[PDB]
Every structure is written in structure tokens, then in C-alpha cells.
Amino acid sequence: GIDAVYPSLVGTADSKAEGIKNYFKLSFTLPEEQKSRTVGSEAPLKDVAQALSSRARYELFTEKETANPAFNGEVIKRYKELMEHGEGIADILRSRLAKFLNTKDVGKRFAQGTEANRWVGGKLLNIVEQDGDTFKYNEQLLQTAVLAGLQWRLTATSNTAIKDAKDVAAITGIDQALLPEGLVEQFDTGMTLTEAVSSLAQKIESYWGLSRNPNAPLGYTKGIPTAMAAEILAAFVESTDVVENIVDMSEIDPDNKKTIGLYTITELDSFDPINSFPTAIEEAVLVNPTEKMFFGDDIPPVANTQLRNPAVRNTPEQKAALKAEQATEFYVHTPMVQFYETLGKDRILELMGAGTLNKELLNDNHAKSLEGKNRSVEDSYNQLFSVIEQVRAQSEDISTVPIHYAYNMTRVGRMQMLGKYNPQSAKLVREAILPTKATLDLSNQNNEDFSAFQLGLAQALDIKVHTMTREVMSDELTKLLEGNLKPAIDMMVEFNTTGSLPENAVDVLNTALGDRKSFVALMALMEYSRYLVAEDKSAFVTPLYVEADGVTNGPINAMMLMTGGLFTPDWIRNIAKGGLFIGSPNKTMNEHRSTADNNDLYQASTNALMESLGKLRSNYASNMPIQSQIDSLLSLMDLFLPDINLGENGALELKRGIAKNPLTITIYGSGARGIAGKLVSSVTDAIYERMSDVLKARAKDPNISAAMAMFGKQAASEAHAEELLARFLKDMETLTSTVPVKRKGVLELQSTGTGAKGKINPKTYTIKGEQLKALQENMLHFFVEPLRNGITQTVGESLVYSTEQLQKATQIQSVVLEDMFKQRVQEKLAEKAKDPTWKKGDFLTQKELNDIQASLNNLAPMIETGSQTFYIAGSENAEVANQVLATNLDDRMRVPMSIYAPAQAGVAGIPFMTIGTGDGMMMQTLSTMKGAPKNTLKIFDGMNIGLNDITDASRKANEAVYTSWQGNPIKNVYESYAKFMKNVDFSKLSPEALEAIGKSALEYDQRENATVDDIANAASLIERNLRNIALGVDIRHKVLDKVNLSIDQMAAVGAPYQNNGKIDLSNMTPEQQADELNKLFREELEARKQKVAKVGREHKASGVRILSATAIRNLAKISNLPSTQAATLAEIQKSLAAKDYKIIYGTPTQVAEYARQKNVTELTSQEMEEAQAGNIYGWTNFDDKTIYLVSPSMETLIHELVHASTFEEVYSFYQGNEVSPTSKQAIENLEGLMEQFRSLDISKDSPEMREAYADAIATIEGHLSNGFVDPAISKAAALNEFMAWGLANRALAAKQKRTSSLVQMVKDVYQAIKKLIWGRKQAPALGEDMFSNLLFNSAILMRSQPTTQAVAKDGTLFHSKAYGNNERLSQLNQTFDKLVTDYLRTDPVTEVERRGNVANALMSATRLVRDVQSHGFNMTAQEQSVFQMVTAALATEAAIDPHAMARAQELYTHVMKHLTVEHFMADPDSTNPADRYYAQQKYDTISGANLVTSLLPTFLGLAMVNEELRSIIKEMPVPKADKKLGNDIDTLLTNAGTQVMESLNRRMAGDQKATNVQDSIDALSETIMAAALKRESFYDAVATPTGNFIDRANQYVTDSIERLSEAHLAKLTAAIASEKQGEIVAQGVMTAMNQGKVWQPFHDLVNDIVGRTKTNANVYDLIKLVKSQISQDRQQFREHLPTVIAGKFSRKL
């Protein structure tokens, strides 16, 4: 033991004594085995100096036969100098020891007997050796530590993996996803004080080779090395090896003030020989090294615990996936590493970054953000070539050395490589080290291997492969290769045969690639250039890959795991965007995006945002200053942030899987204030970047203006840029000098100082302080709140409910666990305080902490799912200890005490379950499934696949998605919450803890004066809610497994997976599929419930009975109601019988079956919670005047007659009709009460009354804040819901209640309805029963016309080969919507004659659009719609402002001087007279001869859409007057077009009613409506893969025949169309069919049709057979035959 080894330690070694004590030999034991080779060496420094003398000596020390060949002669010399450097710092520590022995007579006091070794900063004196008068370190304990410090210096940051997200939020107070760019990347440079010394203290303990004492105070087993590690950290920062930095984000944050210090270690020279082998000392002193690179057969072990979660043990299923990943082998790519080193590190930075950087040509705020951008690349560049240098030393061929990596399980159940820079995280290393390989036959360009080769190249160059067919993708790829990228490819071809690059290589690549610049784009060019120069193209070996990426993986996974209740048609359509197709076998994502829908979930959320903003803006028609504030915010965003779809799509940033999109951030529970800060930070970054362009433009020409140097590329003239500058300055001052505030449901503007003034000064421009705060306040109220409503509309309101309950349960559980852990360490400190041995400054033992942690097991802290384990509250906090661990000898650096204890989870509950169970289980299954794909790199939600296994590995990836979607996150969380309620005691919590749980369990009004019994009642109510959500999810997954599905979530190739369901759901509309799925949902509910327990005509096909008008007249007597109100029904009966009201009633099954047969949408109200109660309600169809009842009684039938009649008066009043004067006052009186209804205080009411009020408000406000529904319909619905609430709560409020404000409201509304029902005649006295407890329970159905913005925005992103797939037109159509379509009035359009002035311009412009296409300019359906819409926008503006087309006249006249007929002829010297005729036809239209005034707007519109005309125009010379701008004629024409529309945008955004332009806009909206519906008809008419009119028609008829009806010869015809002989196809097709015998199967079918041969088949069976043969011949002869002919050429013609 330690008594035997170095027994010359100072002090007494006894456990207890009265004299001085040495606690080192007590807190540390002696392991029996060997861990450090210097345990028995007095002088370890000379033990390694002799070890590193030569290769022969190095072999014997480590006890192995062979060493790493990289230990060559050069690195021996470099280690000798570094070893001497460690000796230089060894003597430095001696000097500080001598100073301590005499300064402040500490040694003299130590000589007296004072226990200074037990102090905060004296723990280092437990090891100091005795020399009598003087004292000194034990030499062995000192030398072994320096080697730990030296090895730490080289690999301090290399081994530091990616920091966890939870830790970053803890040290900042803001979620890492909402942090601005640059600061997040700054973590690689700086590490906090605790992190710097804890890492160094880990090495020191390991190098000593000792064992901790489990029964010793934590202030000695952990504080002794930490105190000495800080000493070694000193004299290292003294040599400037580490720098000191202070954070600024929290410093500049208007609210946060938590300053954080950072520590960054300086790098080393990239050419250092020591960089070729930096792990010589580590692998010599140690026995089993942990810092290693695995070559050949070296396989890493499997970790037994999670990452930074020692309490969680890896499950046996998890350990199988970790083993599989580390078995994959990697090889370097030789061509890339040779290309990288020729460019150099500096040229790489210029290409990838923003060019060369200098303080003169950069904004102050913009320049500092590039430091973190450039820091990552240089570190990654150095790391890659350090690894390669080690590989090259082991073999002559560097491309044949296998390399293995390490993996571990993170806190959310993902797999992450160990190391900061690796192929998983860094993208520079990704293209040099790959595990994929393939062999292809490229001798023919029509092969199938060439098609897969093209897919890899197209995806690398930023082409959306997962949205187009494989034929369309090849068309666009070839254009780039022979077009813009041609100069770059030619340069690359020269490099492959010369090894040299042009001087201006960086400039060439920037012009070629453009905005597609990425490290994978250079890979595509290298492989293509290698292909051209190869001679034998039949055995090409390439590492090119294609990644299978998920389509909105985040939101889609959450939508399938935390959704309950019945199915809805909205859910079916929205889930299709993720790749879940119902009733469509063998369907792929490419087919869906080409014929069904091209809008993803990210775009759908944005569309709903603009509808909510329009509704909010419309409510302030009487408050002009508020409206102008909204327009300023929108105008500023368009100038700098065209699209808000943020993400991890950068170029020089590491990949961590963090979600930074506004849609995903909101769902994960981020705060509203936090979101607004992130959006503001993006806008200001774009402003700062523009300030770095004016500085550069000034250098080239110091005479230009500020407007020219900023908005030059977007200006059509000199004066246009002046308008843009003035608009930008006006908007900026308004936002930063005014703030919106909320005053009882309305917004009021207030002044808070002054904003930015008139001075740019691009070098020193900054927005900060009070101006920054006013920016975020404007965005929070005007942008974030409308954004939340739009998200709830897409993902559904059922998922939002489940997220709130999950967050509340996880927050409450973590707060309790945090309080009891702190309450039990305070007891042990008090118990140990009386112990004489214990002394303040120590802490608990390791065993005591273990028992306290094990004492909370009855509260169920961990969640188990059967394959994964989660510990949300786990963290390495420091607030629990609230002490000081140790400090430096100069009392400068103080290290606090950190323990592994539970911590508050905040709002981390939601992202934990979505990622761990949705994506983690998906990607863990893929590794361990039967037949898993091999040789793939998987990052977090993608998987790189070699080109030889794409079609099969992409199908097993989709299969793993299906298995992942069978989990239940809510059920697993509930199982732990139920046990937590079983062993908790709320009366033993701290006063602050009870306050924290109150904020989650209770509302605002009931928060103050909260009783403990009130906290427990609400806390136990959440447990009931989770039980109902879990039950609903379980039934949903069981039902979905019984139908046929096709899953294409993770795919970019077109290989889906089938679930082999047996119930057919095809040939149905989305509303029909919901009815079928809801039937099975209720069937499963009935079976479980029974398990525990063990007058009118009738329809023929169902038990439903029908009651018509004039059939319930006698029912007045049957009810035997009082005679005073009996006469009322006699009047109600007459009214409803006048408009043909019929009543349908039956059992729930009978009434549901009737709807399916008659195609009726039902609105029955019942839930699983209501199923236990057992009450069903019907619905009313106001469109056709039909009432549907479920199991009616005498009371309910009477209640509905007086309810339907009442709603008719409400509908008529709000439709602009006239009503009785008595009814008009009653509705008006009710309307006024509703205004005060939503402003009451319910804090003094009964708990059961609060729930009723809460439900009413949520549904009422939804109708009022709805923008896509007709306001007349929405207004009536809101009032109808108000009456139902009052009648429902009359009984329970009239008794056992006080006279509260809400109670009086119930009594008033009841009387208000009484006057409305009875009219002007006398009503029954107050307090009398209405109709034996009258109630309103049936729902209403209402429909109306959709708005213009609804249909125009639907077809914006349509694209297809038969429809048109021009990308430039879609982007042009997007900017049109922002300027024109968004500002149209929300009311639905009408049809009036509209005689006026602008209406003449639109009629004239419509005729010219058609006339242009009939006189030489053919257009597709996509080009036609954009041509019509844009021209009508310029036509109405020119009819209001006569000088709008002044600039376009100058450009039109200049073009006419350099135009000739020969410009329109492909062959200038053709002989066919028809070729010249068509060219002359196009010339006349441009000259205006054919068109024969609104002629100018048509030309301006045509010059933007047509692609053939723009090619001719761009080659014309530029006038000398416009040479200053520096733009071609085509861009000058497109910039003039937006100027006209921008002027019109201001016209519609002002006071339309007073300007007398309201009628003119109503004419423009009609034209947009007409053109939107026309492109909705051409689309869906080509909705087939072939895009043919006939093919689509045949498919519709076939599916309509299978609905009513409720093989061999197909192979022979395939052989006829696949003949490759040449001598056989020359004999005709009659001979082949006669020789092919195919005439016999045809005879059998026709013989049945004619009747010669008898058969038992019906008509529908034979019709399905004849129509199946026709489609077979069309498929083979029109599609497959042309491919055979084209396959005989070795080229693409």
C-alpha cells in the first residue's frame, strides 16, 4: 500500500491525532496492478529521456515488438527540445515553493503547528517533503505532473469534443439554438476557468497511477489535484501559451449581465515535425493509452456509460450499434489531398470566406464576426494534414491504410464521434476521408451506372434532386457543365496532367461556382475532370456518394409521436409533406413533389403567417400611425432578409444537429422574447455586411455617392437608388424611436427617445442600447405573435396540447428532485458539524453522495422505454455546494466546487423526447437491423451511400423510419410521473420551491395566495391528463398498421418501403379516408371497454329514420309543456317547415353509416374521456337545412327546434339583411355584453366555473382572429358559441355560488336570449325555466368563398416538365406576391361591370398578352401565368401615374437601334422559306407593327419573362450615360419593372378610401383571381408521370370502374419492343407478332366479348381486362422503345 511506497511523507499518517496530519496517504490508495510506468521511478524525466533516445530503446519500454513507423529520426530531435522546455518549467514551480515558505511567515506559522494544509489555498502542502528547516516537493510527484502538463499542451483542444447544449444554456441563460452566429463558434477558442483546470487535473491523477479513497472527504480526493493543476496552469499562461478573453454578448445584452471569461490556447506551426506524432509521451508512460489513432486491426472498445452522464448505463441494444459503427473502415482520397496542398491555406480562406480581410475594408462589427469563421477552417486544415502525415509513414500507397474511429452515446441518445474535427462534424475533412467506394461502367452515356453517377454530381452542385424526375435532373446538370462551369473544368483538367494551377485560380472558381460555393462542390468538379481524361471508362473507381436526407425531419417526427384524438383531413394532407402516403403503393417523393404538391412544411407555415398579419393590420383601419409602423417593419425585412427559413446551411460552420428554424424553435417551447431576439440579430448582420461593400466600392472609385455604393445593383437609374436610400433611412429611425405597448387588449404607441440620424459612416456603424431594445419590441408584438398562430394551424392544435402537458410534468418533477437533494446534504453537513474530525472547508465523502442519490429512486427520476434511458435533470452544477474547492498560491485563480446533482430542466422536456425517441431510435435501428447497409457514414439524420448500393440501402433506411414511429414518448413519461405522485410530500418543500411549482401548476390569477393543498390538487390533475393522451396515441398506431402505406421520409433516390397492410384505402378523397380510419378508431375503443366488464320512414340500407316537414305538428302536445310557452312551438314549427327542415336520427353506428353512403361530412362530438361519460351530440347542416340527431329524447328534439330557429336570426342580421326591430336590439345587446365577457376577472369563482369560462374564450377568440374565413360567417359563429356557454352554466351558477361578476353575467345573457326568442309579446317572468332546462348542444356547418390570396399563393411553386420548370420565373413570381397580392383586401372578390378608367387599361392589356403569344412567342403554362399577372400590375399603375413609364422609354428606343431580323434565326443562311417567315413575325411584334395605348407596359412585361429575347438584348452595347451603373441591358430592364410595382405598393398601403383608389384595386384583384384559377386547371390535367393528356384521362376512368365493381401476353409484348437484333426489326411488326405467338391470348378475351365462348365473368371484369392491354402497349412502345434506339449511341445526342 501507500505505507510501503514513499513512506517519507511529512506529517502523521494516522487517521486521527492531535498533532499535524497528512491526508494524502489517507485519501489515496495503491492499486495492485500497473497503470503508470513511473510509479517506481525516482526520476521519471530521465526515464522518458532514455526511452525516446532511439526506436530500439522505445520498443523495449512499451513491451511490444514493433512501434509506429512515424517515430522516424526527425521527430526524435523535435522531442528533445520540447522535453527541455518541460525542464524549464519544472524549475519555475520550485521558485514559487520557496516564496510560499517565507511570505507572510506561513512556513514559520507552519513550524509552530498551525494546520495550514487544511486551508483553502494550502492543500498542496499535503505532499511536501521534509528537509528539517526547509520543505520541498517530492521529486517523483513533481516530474510525473509536468509530463501531464506537456502532453496536455499539445492536445488540449484537439481532444475536446462538441460541448453539450444543456451546458451552454446553463452558462448563458439563453438556449444555444437562439444564440447569434460567431458567439456559438467562439466556444472552440475559449473555455471557462473550471473547464481549463478540470481537464488538466484529469491527466495529473491518471499519470500518478493512484486510486481514490471511497471514504474520504471530497475536498482532498478532488481538491488536491485541482489546486496543483492550477499551479501547472500558471507559468504556462505566463509564457503566453494561453490567452485571456472576456465575452461580449451578455455584456451587450440589454437584460443579461452575466459576464463570462474565456481561455484560448495558442496554436503551433503547421510544418512542425512534432505534429506528425503528438502522442509519444502519452503512449510511453501509460500502459493502455486512450489518445490513439486506430490503424489496421485496432478496434476501439465500447463505452459503458453515456456522455457526461455517469449515472446512465448504456442499454444492451445501444451497445450493439456502437460496436457496428466502429467496425467500418476509412481510406483517404489521394487526388483531393494533393489539390488542397497546392492551393495553400491562405487561398482556401479567400475562396471559402469573404476574400482577403483588412481593417480598412471591413465594418467594425462585421469584421469581428469573421474571427470565429476563419478560426474553424485553419484548425481543421491543420488537423487533416497532421493525420495524413501519420498515415503516409506506414505504407508507400497512402490510399490503402484502414482507419477506425470512436463513437459514444450523447445525452439525447445519438451517436457522436470523439474529437472536435472529424468527417462527422467538419466538412473539410469530409471530402478527404471517406468509407464509400464503387465501381462503375461509364463506357456508354445511356447506361444505368451513368445515371447514378450523374445523381451524385447534381446533388453536390446544389440541385434539388428529391423534387424532380431523373430525366429532368440530367437536363439541368448538363447545362452547368457546358455553361458557367466550363472554364473551371478546363482548369481542373490541366491540373490532373501537369500538377500546377493558374495564378488567378481563386478568381476563376468564384466566377464559376458563384453562390454554390462549398467543399463538396469542389469534389464534383474533381471527379468529372478525372472522368474525361480516363482512357478505360469501364472500370472507373470513385468515392462519390449521395446523401439520403430527411424532409423536415424535426416537425414530422413530433407530429406522429405526440398526437391524439381522431383523424382529420388536415392531418392527412400535411403529413404527406413528410413522406407518409396512404392508399398509394410504390409512390415516391419525386412523384409527390411533381404532380401533387410542391409546398413543404416550412413554406406552409410562412403562408399562414401572412394571412394572420393581414387580419391584424386590418383591425387598425382607424389608427393610421399603428398601420404605418407595421409597414416599416415589413419593408426593412425585405431589404436585407428576403427569406426567414434559417437553418444549418452555412459553409464555414461545424455540424451539430442543432435546430435554428423558426418553425422548429417555436414547437420546442422557446420563449416569445427569445425568438424575437434571434430574428433581429439576423437583420442587423445583413446591414453590417452591406456596410463592408460601400467601403470596398469607395476604394475603386472615391467619387460615387452613398446610394450608388449600396443599392447600385438593384437600381434602374441614378435617381432610383436615391429613393431606396431615403426609404431605408426613414424606416430605421421610426423603429428605433417608437415602441408599441399593450393597454387592455389594444396597442398604443409610445416615444422612448430618438433613433438613428442622418450619417452613415460605414466603418463605425452600430445599433445598440435603447435603440436595440426598441427594435426587438416592435418585432415581438408585430411578428412573433402572428407567427405562433400560423404554426398552430399547420401542425394542428392537438399536438400543441400534448407539448404543454409534457413540459409541465418534466418541470415539476425536476424542481422537486432539486430541492430534496439540497435538503439532504444540509442535514449531513449539520450532522458532521459536531464531529471533531470534520472541519469546515471539507465536504461529503463519495459514499455519502452515493447514498443521497440512491435515496431519490422512489421518485422515478429516469425514464425507460425498453431500449433507451433518459436522465433530463442530470447536470454538473455548482450552486448546491456553494463553496470554494481550491485556489492558486497567490490567491488569484479561485476554483468553485462542482457536484453531479439534479437541476431544473426548464423547457428542455420537449426536445428531449422528440430527438431521442423519434430520430435516435430511427438511426440506432438501422445499424442493428437484419441486413443493415454496409460502408456508410451517418451524421444525425442523413446517410452517405456509395453509388453501387443506393437503390437498396435507401429502402432499409425508410424501413427503420417505420419501426421508429411505433414508440410512445407520452406513455413512458406518464409511467414515471405516476410513481412520483406515489412517494412525494408537498408539505416538506422549501418556500422557494413551492413558488416555482406554482408558476407551472396554477394560472396568474390564482398564483398569489397559493395553498399547499392547492398545489397538490393541480399537480395531481396533470397525471390524469397524461393518461388520456397516452391511450389515444396507442390506438392510433394500432389502426395505422392495418392499412397499406408507403414511407419515403429519408429518400432522394426513389425507393420507398411498404407496410403490407390488408385494408385498401385507395380511390378515396382525403375526407373519405378519415371516415374509414375513424371507424376503426371507435371499434378499438369499444373492444377495450367491454373487456373489463367481462314515428318516421326508415332507410332501407340502415336503421336511420327520416322525419320531414309537416310531420311533427302534433309534437307540441306530446311535450306537455306549459301552455304559455306551448304556443311558441306552433310558431317555430311554421318557420322551419317553410324552408324544408328535415330531421335525421338514429344510433351512433346507424347515423355514421348513412353519411358514408350519401357522402356527408359529420360533426359528431365525442372523445375517449366523453366515451367514459357516454354522451353523443349531433350536428346541423345549415347549407341544406338538415338536422342530425344521435339517440334523441323528447327534450333534445324540442331543444333543437328553438335552437335552429334562433341561429337563423343571427345569420340574417350579420349578412346585411333586415330583421324585426325587437330582434335587432336583442342581438345588439348581446353583442355589447360579449365585449365585456372577454375582460372579466375569474379569480374569485369556483374551480369548476373557471374551466367553463376558459373553454369559451379560446373558441370565441379563434373566430375573431381568423383571416382566411369570410368575416360574415366568422362573426355569426362567435356569437352563437357565446349563448351556448351561458345556457350550459345556468344550473350550476344559480346555486352554490356567490354574487361574482361572472355570476351576474350568466343571469344577464339568459334574459337577453329570452327577449330574442319571444319577440315583442310578453315573456315568462324572471327566474322561470325556459323549456325544461334549455340547452344548445348541436354544431353548425358553414361554408363560404375563399379569398383571392388563398388560390393565388397555392400554385406559385408549381413545376413539371409538361407544365414548365423554369426556376427564374418562380422567384420572380414570389416577389410579386410580396408587393401586390399581400396588400389586396381580404374580402372575397365579386363580379361587377366595373366601368371606369383603370378597368379600360386591364381589358386592353389582356388582349395584347394573347396577341403576343399568337405572333411568334410561344410560351409554356408556367410562363403564360407570370406574363399575365406582371403585365396587369404595370398596366394599372400607368393608368394612374402618367410618368411611370418615363424610364422604360429610354431603354426601348435604344434597343430598337441594334435589332435585326437575323437575330431571331438559328441558321442565318437557311434555305427553307418558313424559317425566315417566323423570324420576321417576331421582329414585327417588338417593332409594334403586329400589335398596332398601353403598348409600353406589355413590352416591359415581356422583357422579363421571355428567355430567348433576353439573350439577344444582353449582347447589345451599353450607353455611355449608363456605363457608370455597370449593368447589362437585360438587368436594367428587370430593375425598372420592380420600380413601377414598388410605387404601386405604396399606393395600396395608404389611405385607400380617402384616395378614391378602392374601386381600381377591386379591378386588379379580379384579374389576379381569373389567372390563378386558369393555371389550376392545366395543372391536374397533366398529373401523371408522363405528363400526357390521354394518360391522365385513362387513369381516372380506370379508378372509377373499380369503385363500381364492389397477365401472360403482357410479357410477350415487352419482348417485341425490346428487340436488339436489327435483322429482325427490319421485317416489320406483323411478322414479329405472328412469330411471337401473342395472337392467342388476344383471341380468348375477344371471344368472351362477342359471345362465341361462354364465361361466368360480368361486364366489369372484362372491361378491366381490355383497358389493361391498351395501357401496356402505350407503356412499351411510346416510352421503352425510344430508349432502346438511344442506347445504341455512345453519346448523348
Numbering used by the authors: 1008 to 2101, 2124 to 2521, 2529 to 2642, 2664 to 2750
Copy text from the publication.
N4-like phages have a genome size of about 75 kb, nearly twice that of T7, and encode around 70–90 ORFs, including a characteristic large virion-associated RNA polymerase (vRNAP) unique to this family of bacterial viruses. The massive 3,500-residue vRNAP 18,19, present in 4 ± 1 copies inside the mature virion 20, is ejected into the host upon infection. In stark contrast to the N4 transcriptional program, which has been studied extensively 17, many key questions about the role of phage N4 vRNAP as an ejection protein and its part in the DNA ejectosome remain unanswered. vRNAP (gp50) consists of three predicted domains: a likely membrane-spanning N-terminal domain (NTD), a single-subunit RNA polymerase (RNAP) domain, and a large C-terminal domain of unknown function (CTD). In this study, we use a complementary top-down and bottom-up approach by determining the cryo-EM structures of both the full-length recombinantly expressed vRNAP and the fully asymmetric N4 virion tail.
Single particle analysis (SPA) of cryomicrographs revealed a heterogeneous mix of particles with two predominant and two minor populations. 1007–2101) and a tightly bound complex of RNAP and CTD with an unresolved NTD, referred to as ΔNv-RNAP tight complex (res. N4 isolated RNAP and ΔN-vRNAP tight complex were real-space refined to a model to map correlation coefficients of CC = 0.90 and 0.84, respectively. The tight complex of the RNAP and CTD forms a compact structure where the CTD binds the RNAP on the opposing face of the DNA hairpin promoter binding site 24, leaving the region open for promoter binding. Despite a large binding interface of 1,659 Å2, PISA analysis of the C2 and RNAP interface indicates a weak interaction with a ΔG of nearly zero at −0.2. Interestingly, interactions are slightly stronger at a ΔG of Ȓ2.1 for RNAP to C1 with a 725 Å2 interface. A salt bridge between D2012 (RNAP) and R2279 (C1) likely serves as a clasp for stabilizing the tight complex, which is not predicted to be stable in solution. The CTD buries a large surface area of the RNAP occupied by the fingers and palm including the palm insertion and extended foot domains, but despite the extensive interface, the overall structure of the N4 RNAP domain is relatively unchanged in complex with the CTD (RMSD 3.7 Å), barring a few changes in subdomains unique to N4 and a subtle shift of the fingers. Cryo-EM reconstructions of the four high-resolution states provide clear evidence that the CTD drives the B-motif loop into the active site in a conformation that we predict is inactive. Although the CTD makes sparse contacts with RNAP, it allosterically regulates three crucial motifs of the RNAP core: the intercalating beta-hairpin, the B-motif loop, and the N4 plug module, thereby repressing transcriptional activity.
